[PDB]
Design a protein around this nucleic acid. Structure first.
Ligand SMILES: [Mg+2]
Ligand SMILES: [Mg+2]
Ligand SMILES: [Mg+2]
Ligand SMILES: [Mg+2]
Ligand SMILES: [Mg+2]
Ligand SMILES: [Mg+2]
Ligand SMILES: [Mg+2]
Ligand SMILES: [Mg+2]
Ligand SMILES: [Mg+2]
Ligand SMILES: [Mg+2]
Ligand SMILES: [Mg+2]
Ligand SMILES: [Mg+2]
Ligand SMILES: [Mg+2]
Ligand SMILES: [Mg+2]
Ligand SMILES: [Mg+2]
Ligand SMILES: [Mg+2]
Ligand SMILES: [Mg+2]
Ligand SMILES: [Mg+2]
Ligand SMILES: [Mg+2]
Lengths: 125, 55, 141, 179
RNA sequence: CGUGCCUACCAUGGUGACCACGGGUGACGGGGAAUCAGGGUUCGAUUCCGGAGAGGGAGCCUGAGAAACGGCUACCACAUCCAAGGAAGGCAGCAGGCGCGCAAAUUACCCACUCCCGACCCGGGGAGGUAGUGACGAAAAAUAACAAUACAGGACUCUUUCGAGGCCCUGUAAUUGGAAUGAGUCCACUUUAAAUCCUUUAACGAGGAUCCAUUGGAGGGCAAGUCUGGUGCCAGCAGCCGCGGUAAUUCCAGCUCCAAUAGCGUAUAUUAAAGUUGCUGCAGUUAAAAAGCUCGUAGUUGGAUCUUGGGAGCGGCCCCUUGCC
């Protein structure tokens, strides 16, 4: 049904990564999701799906092509190393657990006021 | 000098008339279409001594 | 008649910079007395407070009793004879209300029917006088 | 501070004399002839023709053997040919000035639909180009103010749509009413 | 570091009618912005560069770099807690509050992008980026559209046709559909640091109670009524000319039109028109304007005269004056 083709293709052997521009054509239904595009690209590259990422998607005003940037690696350790934590957050490899405003800054001020043992008492709890 | 009691005399003593149920008007491109087809398709039997956009 | 040499441009700019003041528009635009003499401080609009309601007379060929409002300003603190625009609005302007005022058609001259009124009421107590003349936006009190 | 974009171009010129009876009749017959919405998109075409005339008079001011004149004139003639106003014949600069307002309205989208079928009454062709039912190429066109280039000039289509593309937009209402 | 930057002595110099000096600026300077012949005119606080200030001005440690202010010291004006003996302050940073006003937004999220800083691949950043208000302004852009049936108001090809209509707008509060498509209602996507919107898509989703286009005008300038009813120099309209005093082409309303159109009126500053600031490009007998006359400084302007015809080679160099040796 869908047709996935890479237009531009580069290889950076310094990180063992392969960058590509991916166009997924749709003469039919809606935008095929992240997981399904990832699985089809993993089947077309004939490796494990947990090493290939993709980011960004467009739509050319009525069916048409959807354009993104795909990253094929060769190691899950290299994926943990050379990728940001928010692009690991699509699969949940990193969790921050404090996505809150003013908590860090109020702990900064409560450490800025007192010093030493009282600072370790107040700022760490 | 003059009296200040006569304010809005004509607006008060004018008898009110209810606005009738006018049908809706085609607007925009449709309005320019009817403006073209009102004064550019069937005007040529008339003569220049008289003009009738309102009477 | 003129001065038409190659080194006469200082004489030209001197004569032109002198004779440019005799135009009325240039001197009323670039002389400070037309800012420190007029009201509004050289602005577009001004708020004010109703002091009294005056029935002024019209000119010689037109016999009418125009309705004006004497307005104490807030910005400068002057007194301005404003003007009630429409057929009514004398009953819509009460005593000591916030009144926005503007010009008629020109800063200097006035309208040829009212003798000494340069200014016009636009709002009455933060609700527009067009709404007070129409049906919508009835007055608070 | 912020740095994103700041630009302001007006393809919109209100004329000086507001109410001329001959000019208002000319603009009304132009709208009724080429199927337009309002007079600002007549003033668009008038301003673009005026700007092309400004460029043409600026080129004709220059000396004939000037390389900037030759480059800019050849580029302007190439752009006018690829639009489709001029021909592959007269490549002079006075032939640019010898034009009319109606040529760009002819080279707009729906007038090419009038010249190449599936139009059916330009006031309905407005609807046919607004609703996705006339498709110059695989990139779908949704815009009435579309200058059709002469290099393709023939691609009029529609895919995955109502009359031939396929689908039940509101005939399922009629089928559920009968059933 | 060179400097009258400062001191001692000596000389009397320095600037100016080509406008110094002294005032005013509702004056931060530029790149630029608006205004369409050309020439000009008016703004530029504002996102890029440079200068100045952190309530006023004075002084200073540290430091390579500060007379620093999200550093310190003292005075003045405010102003906080005070058990009254003392501490403590600077939003012309980001929000927000009062006041001033004609006049100008939320105590939002994130360091994901851009970069910056530090011992440093890891931390921080109201610098920034995203979202909320937003009709300052700019670009695209539906508003009931649309093709058909029929009454024909009839225009038009042609035959005495009082019509044969493979062509035409129009009222049809008359029908038929494509049941066109959009706005909204919402599933799933996608965007994204996490989200929102556009975009993709499933399902609802118009037939006049519809899902409703306003803003101004209709005497001339300037498009549109010598329509109807009241008002009868009263109310008022009208930026000017003017209308209204019983038959209102201008008031109020109704109907119908017209102007532009999801941007219209209004006020103000400004530009063009304004050849009504004139260098291009204005005038000076009478319309506003040539000093009573003359001399004369500064300024402005200032007669002619000193390189000439031609040669080589056709369909650019020199001589008969043409780089000095
Ligand atoms: Mg006036
Ligand atoms: Mg001395
Ligand atoms: Mg210009
Ligand atoms: Mg110019
Ligand atoms: Mg400097
Ligand atoms: Mg400083
Ligand atoms: Mg302050
Ligand atoms: Mg600072
Ligand atoms: Mg501060
Ligand atoms: Mg009126
Ligand atoms: Mg009327
Ligand atoms: Mg007229
Ligand atoms: Mg007016
Ligand atoms: Mg004159
Ligand atoms: Mg006389
Ligand atoms: Mg005289
Ligand atoms: Mg004389
Ligand atoms: Mg002399
Ligand atoms: Mg001479």
């Amino acid at each position: 049904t869908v047709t996935i083709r890479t237009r531009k293709f580069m290889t950076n052997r310094l990180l063992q990564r392969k960058q590509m521009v991916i166009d997924v054509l749709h003469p039919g239904k809606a935008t095929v999701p992240k997981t399904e595009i990832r699985e089809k690209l993993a089947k077309m590259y004939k490796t494990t799906p947990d090493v290939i990422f993709v980011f960004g998607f467009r739509t050319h005003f009525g069916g048409g092509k959807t354009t993104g940037f795909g990253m094929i690696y060769d190691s899950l350790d290299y994926a943990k190393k050379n990728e940001p934590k928010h692009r690991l957050a699509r699969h949940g490899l990193y969790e921050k657990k404090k996505t809150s405003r003013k908590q860090r800054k109020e702990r900064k001020n409560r450490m800025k006021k007192v010093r030493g043992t009282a600072k370790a008492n107040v700022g760490a709890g | 000098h003059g009296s200040l009691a006569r304010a809005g005399k004509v607006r008060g003593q004018t008898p009110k008339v209810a606005k009738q149920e006018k049908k809706k008007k085609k607007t925009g491109r449709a309005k320019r279409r009817m403006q073209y087809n009102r004064r550019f398709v069937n005007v040529v039997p008339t003569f220049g001594k008289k003009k009738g956009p309102n009477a | 008649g003129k001065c038409r040499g190659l080194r006469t441009a200082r004489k030209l700019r001197s004569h032109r910079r002198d004779q440019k003041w005799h135009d009325k528009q240039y001197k009323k635009a670039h002389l400070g007395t037309a800012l420190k003499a007029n009201p509004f401080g050289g602005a577009s609009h001004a708020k004010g407070i109703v002091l009294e309601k005056v029935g002024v007379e019209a000119k010689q060929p037109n016999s009418a009793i125009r309705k004006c409002v004497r307005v104490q300003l807030i910005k400068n603190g002057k007194k301005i004879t404003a003007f009630v625009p429409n057929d009514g609005c004398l009953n819509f302007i009460e005593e000591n209300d916030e009144v926005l005022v503007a010009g008629f058609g020109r800063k200097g001259h006035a309208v040829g029917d009212i003798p000494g009124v340069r200014f016009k009421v636009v709002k009455v107590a933060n609700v527009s006088l067009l709404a007070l003349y129409k049906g919508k936006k009835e007055r608070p009190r | 501070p912020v740095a994103r974009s700041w630009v302001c171009r007006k393809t919109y010129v209100t004329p000086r004399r507001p109410f001329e009876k001959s000019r208002l009749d000319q603009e009304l017959k132009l709208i009724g002839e080429y199927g337009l919405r309002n007079k600002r998109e007549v003033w668009r075409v008038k301003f673009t023709l005026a700007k092309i005339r400004k460029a043409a008079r600026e080129l004709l001011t220059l000396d004939e053997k000037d390389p900037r004149r030759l480059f800019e004139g050849n580029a302007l003639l190439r752009r006018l040919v690829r639009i489709g106003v001029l021909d592959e014949g007269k490549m002079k600069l006075d032939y640019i000035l010898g034009l009319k307002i109606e040529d760009f309205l002819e080279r707009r989208l729906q007038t090419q639909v009038f010249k190449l079928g599936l139009a059916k009454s330009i006031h309905h062709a407005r609807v046919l180009i607004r609703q996705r039912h006339i498709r110059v190429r695989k990139q779908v066109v949704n815009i009435p103010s579309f200058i059709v280039r002469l290099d393709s000039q023939k691609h009029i289509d529609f895919s995955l749509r109502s009359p031939y593309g396929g689908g039940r937009p509101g005939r399922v209402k009629r089928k559920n009413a009968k059933k």
